[PDB]
């Protein structure tokens, strides 16, 4: 059975229960089948993983697990104990068994142990007992897997979870070698591809990792994740993953934007890609997503296309975005001519900027307040900056009659963006 | 009675019921007394000001207003009809009356009409009936105020609401002359100072504006507002407003950070100011703020962390001492790197330890039991910890013998403005 769906696996504010229920509804409707529960900052998932859910938390989770079963989504419950567990201590192993049994009593039948993003060293006690980190991790994981009656779905996220985190590299790492040899065959392995955020996940990268882990991985895809950069948001199509990976993978679970409503395109296009090969065009999958998303929102299709192009993919701007940048780069490189070419290219660029502003004001006025609030700060930010760029292009055109500086005298604080953070950033090459 | 408290007055996601009731507790605890409801993107406040509350919304607003009374906070309900109102259409007037009457029935007794951030140009039909934009605003505001029974608190926000918006200047504004002359004496005028986000609000500028509006204004203070720049947050102390303003003002309502829990300092130091040294009030606010940060109770964050966090996200026109120190240290290390004395190595090591305190603050805040406090600040703290981590690596690199898309499209355009970093 191929696992396809969403992992809530990002850093920051987790989704709340009704967002999660809505997500299941979306996953079902688009024929996805899986939800992995792993929010880095839900405190009982990681920071205080020893802690039992309270009576009130237990009711909420039981309700959530019932909703998943009601929408035919498999609910995988993850836990992340690696920051401070003593792998050899008797009391630790049973605290973990006790935590997982509680969740099993809520109705959960599928589980995961995640060991990503922790210090690669062991305390003195585990060093007496295990020959390496990998041995400590695989031993606790096999024992938990057995303890729970070998559940049909059990996931392991390695500490070396992408190319970049392999020491010294993927094909020769002693950590992954130990994982491949000793991790029980019914346990799946999570993998994010060559990098944490993979621009592409080439078939030969996956063959290569497959031979060392001794199984087809489940992809934890960070393509649409946006927790690592405050200003960024990803509304472009699922892309850079050939449909030929499907036969070579146990699943793909997408870790998408923090802002719940921003993930319409991320999940809908993943569903299109999946259903295409249970080939795939990213631009046509994007067209279908935006068309259908439009019905949730006055806001036009063309508003949504420009919004997606402005907030597209981690390594790529969309068409309307890449085009505005090119023009601005041109206008700015040729501004000394201030000739009919520059003036008419300027007036077009200013009109393009006007479409950003119109997209902002129509969104601001739409009826779906929930979608507006999740997007608000991205849309405000792009409208403010495009309004400054537009007024800069005007100022360059005005240089034939004015020697005044771009900013005249005392400014409001938003004329200089980024605060102390932005000052450190500007001192980096 | 002097109004001192908070306007929920910013753009973006508004606060929800639970955040607002918590606000009213803090205001009462610190002896503030006023809340002005005015969130720019709460639908029926502005974009859809004509539309009446549904049964479910009425229930919520009523519960909110009862909570204010229960905590002894005066609730002022604002509405912002200026975008598309035809002032001479009696149906527009009646719609405004009926919307306010509906809120009266929820228990509300104080009100505001806001005309900020709108065009000076009236429609043809209004130009018939009124001699100026200010006559149009003043006669609807006077009519509403009399219609509601001359409520003891009624506020008016002018279109010319700070010094730099006043045409041709403050002392000679025809708009403000008419406001000063026609607006009934029981109606208060809102004012943000010399600018939208005022660095200082000098006594003389208040004497100036008061003469033309013929009354002491209520300050709408944007010193801690952060809706205008995604990357900014303000945890430094209320500052730049002399306590000698108090006998010259009818109140101060602070429009603070969009992230509710980030506003502990902004509101605690306003209370201190109201009841003055900014560094002393900062120290009192952070000392009391610390008590909100404990780890959760288990069955199986320091004052110096908070001082550093406030200094990294201080005030719109100044960084806190530790933030300015780190930035000067980094500048120097960078300017003197071609050298690699024992001096640069000594100072690079001390700087790396400073970067480490940033990363430690993030780690300990992530252990906090009040999860709403961590979530409200999360994206600012993650951002400064990521940058510092990169900066510490760069300082290591400059000493070793041996992100291209950061900020996305917006970041790219911004770096192309040849003016970028002009104020650094």
């Amino acid at each position: 059975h191929f696992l396809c769906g969403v992992v809530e696996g990002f850093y920051g504010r987790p989704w709340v229960m009704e967002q999660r229920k809505e997500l299941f509804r979306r996953l079902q409707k688009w024929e996805l089948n899986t939800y992995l529960y792993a929010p880095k900052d839900d405190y009982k998932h990681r920071m205080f993983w020893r802690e039992m859910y309270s009576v009130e938390e237990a009711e909420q989770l039981m309700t959530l697990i019932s909703a998943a079963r009601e929408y035919e989504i498999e609910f995988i419950y993850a836990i992340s104990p690696g920051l401070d567990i003593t792998f050899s201590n008797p009391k630790e192993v049973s605290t973990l068994k006790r935590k997982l049994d509680q969740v099993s009593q809520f109705g959960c039948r599928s589980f995961a142990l995640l060991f990503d993003n922790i210090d690669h060293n062991m305390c003195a006690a585990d060093k007496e007992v295990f020959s390496s980190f990998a041995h400590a991790q695989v031993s606790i994981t096999n024992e938990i897997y057995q303890y729970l009656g070998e559940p049909e779905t059990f996931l392991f996220c390695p500490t070396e979870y992408c190319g970049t985190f392999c020491y010294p590299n993927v094909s020769q790492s002693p950590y992954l070698r130990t994982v491949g040899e000793k991790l029980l065959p019914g346990i799946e392995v999570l993998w994010t591809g060559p990098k944490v955020v993979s621009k592409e996940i080439p078939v030969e990268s996956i063959e290569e990792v497959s031979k060392i882990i001794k199984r087809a991985p489940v992809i934890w895809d960070n393509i649409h994740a946006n927790d690592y950069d405050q200003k960024r948001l990803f509304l472009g199509p699922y892309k850079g993953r050939s449909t030929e990976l499907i036969p070579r993978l146990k699943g793909v679970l997408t870790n998408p934007n923090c802002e719940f409503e921003a993930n319409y395109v991320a999940i809908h296009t993943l569903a299109t890609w999946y259903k295409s090969n249970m080939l795939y065009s990213p631009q046509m999958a994007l067209k279908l997503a935006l068309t259908e998303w439009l019905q949730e929102f006055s806001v036009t299709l063309e508003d949504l296309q420009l919004l997606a192009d402005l907030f597209y993919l981690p390594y790529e701007h969309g068409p309307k975005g890449a085009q505005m940048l090119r023009e601005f780069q041109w206008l700015r490189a040729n501004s000394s001519v201030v000739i009919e070419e520059w003036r008419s290219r300027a007036a077009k660029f200013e009109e393009m900027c006007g479409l950003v502003m119109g997209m902002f004001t129509r969104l601001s006025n739409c009826a779906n307040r929930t979608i507006l609030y999740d997007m608000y700060s991205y849309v405000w930010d792009i409208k403010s900056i495009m309004s400054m760029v537009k007024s800069f292009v005007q100022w360059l055109g005005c240089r034939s009659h004015s020697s005044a500086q771009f900013l005249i005298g005392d400014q409001e604080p938003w004329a200089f963006r980024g605060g102390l953070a932005g000052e450190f950033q500007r001192l980096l090459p | 009675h002097f109004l001192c408290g908070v306007v929920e007055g910013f753009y973006g996601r508004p606060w929800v019921m639970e955040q607002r009731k918590e606000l009213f507790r803090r205001l009462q605890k610190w002896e503030l007394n006023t809340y002005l409801y005015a969130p720019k993107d709460d639908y029926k406040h502005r974009m859809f000001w004509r539309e009446m509350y549904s049964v479910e919304e009425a229930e919520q607003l009523m519960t909110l207003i009862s909570a204010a009374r229960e905590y002894e906070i005066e609730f002022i309900y604002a509405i912002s009809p200026g975008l598309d109102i035809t002032f001479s259409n009696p149906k527009e007037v009646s719609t405004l009356k009926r919307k306010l009457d509906q809120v009266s029935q929820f228990g509300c007794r104080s009100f505001a009409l806001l005309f900020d951030n709108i065009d000076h140009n009236m429609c043809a039909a209004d130009k018939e009936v009124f001699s100026s934009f200010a006559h149009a605003q003043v006669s609807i505001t006077n009519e509403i105020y009399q219609y509601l029974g001359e409520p003891e608190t009624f506020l008016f926000c002018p279109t010319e609401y700070c010094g730099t918006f006043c045409y041709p200047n403050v002392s000679q504004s025809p708009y403000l002359r008419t406001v000063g002359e026609k607006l009934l004496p029981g109606i208060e005028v809102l004012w943000t100072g010399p600018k939208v986000v005022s660095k200082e609000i000098p006594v003389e500028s208040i004497e100036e504006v008061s003469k033309i509006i013929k009354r002491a204004p209520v300050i709408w203070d944007n010193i801690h507002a952060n809706d205008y720049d995604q990357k900014r947050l303000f945890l430094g102390p209320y500052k730049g407003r002399s306590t000698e303003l108090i006998p010259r003002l009818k109140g101060v309502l602070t429009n603070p950070n969009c992230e509710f829990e980030a506003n502990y300092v902004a509101i605690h130091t306003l209370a201190t100011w109201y009841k003055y040294s900014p560094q002393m009030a900062l120290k009192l606010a952070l000392t009391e703020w610390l008590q909100e940060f404990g780890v959760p109770h288990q069955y199986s964050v320091t004052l110096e962390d908070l001082q550093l966090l406030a200094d990294l996200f201080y005030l719109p026109y100044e960084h806190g001492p530790k933030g300015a120190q780190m930035l000067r240290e980094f500048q120097w290390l960078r300017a003197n790197s071609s050298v690699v004395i024992e001096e640069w190595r000594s100072r690079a090591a001390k700087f790396e330890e400073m970067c480490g305190l940033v990363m430690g603050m993030f780690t300990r805040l992530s252990n906090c039991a009040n999860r709403t406090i961590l979530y409200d600040m999360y994206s600012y703290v993650w951002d400064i910890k990521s940058i510092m981590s990169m900066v510490k690596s760069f300082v290591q690199w400059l000493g070793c013998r041996s992100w291209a898309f950061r900020g996305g499209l917006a970041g790219e355009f911004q770096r192309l403005l040849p003016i970028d970093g002009a104020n650094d």
Binding site: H120, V196, N222, D227, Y228 | W382, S386, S389, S393, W403
Partner: peptide, 9 residues
């Protein structure tokens, strides 16, 4: 090498 953030390559 935590917080999904390796050093620069």
């Amino acid at each position: 090498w935590v917080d999904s953030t390796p050093p620069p390559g």
